[PDB]
Amino acid sequence: PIAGTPSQVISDGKAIKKVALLGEEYVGMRPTMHVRVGDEVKKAQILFEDKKNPGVKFTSPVSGKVVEINRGAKRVLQSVVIEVAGDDQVTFDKFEANQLASLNRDAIKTQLVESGLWTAFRTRPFSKVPAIDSTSEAIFVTAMDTNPLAAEPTVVINEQSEAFVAGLDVLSALTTGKVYVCKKGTSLPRSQQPNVEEHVFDGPHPDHVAWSINYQDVIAVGQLFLTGELYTQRVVSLAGPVVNKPRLVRTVMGASLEQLVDSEIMPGEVRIISGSVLSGTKATGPHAYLGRYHLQVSVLREG
User: Fold this and answer.
1) Which residues are CB-neighbours of 122 under 8 A, at least 6 positions away?
2) How deeply is 169 buried, as exposed, middle or buried, from its count of CB atoms within 10 A (0-12, 13-18, 19+)?
3) Which residues, other chains included, contact 219 with Cβ-Cβ below 8 Å and sequence gap of 6+?
4) How far apart are the first and last CA of the chain?
5) All residues at 6 or more sequence positions from 177 whose CB lies less than 8 Å from its CB, including other chains
6) Among residues 20, 43, 264, 273, which is most buried (max CB within 10 A)?
């Protein structure tokens, strides 16, 4: 019973020379561009802002040069594409791990907003990035994944136990109430803060607004406050019936998916999806990049 089931083992992904942010992934987003084609950007430099969500910043995952600003019907921002070059970056304050749970909420927000990592959060429902002036009594951490062919979160978190817990400690200070780690039964490194809860699930077989953030973005939150640098590493499941060796591969936020799957694939006509067949983007043309909230890439036969 495989049908493209990934080996839950991490290895290096194929080389990535360009990345993008995808404008249509952010509910209600109406962009104001802060770069144009030809601009050089640092990692964590702002590429655009949302007119309908003032103060939220959408920042570059890499140092490089803006090579494409793709727009569709009614001029919607499809993608801002950055060709990797150099290692320039905006840096932020760093802290000892023992200080994180005691930081002030407003300083936490400012660092998350300024770095762009604030976009990791989405409200429930509406699925919008929270307003920067808002708070939540309930931050949910998704440390499980029910999508077919997803990466097992425990395997990823095991490489990054310190940063995962550090991220939970930051969230424990950010929430006005509790943090809820949604997980399968398998044990995980545990925050020591009393308002971080675990919610254990098993499956599948086969204002009062909560926020949600996935476990890889929690690792990124811990790295941001421990090191002062935006942490753009991703571990994604590369899987599907036409993937020769489905497995977990290291890549970067926003990675070119044409470059990521370069001869990982059996011959024939195939379709690349950022995310899963249940929740994904057809990764073609200006959309052929890893979506902000996607932790897997599915490649399937065409018919």
Assistant:
1) 128, 129, 130, 211, 212, 213, 293
2) buried
3) 156, 157, 160, 163, 164, 167, 231
4) 23
5) 136, 137, 138, 195
6) 20
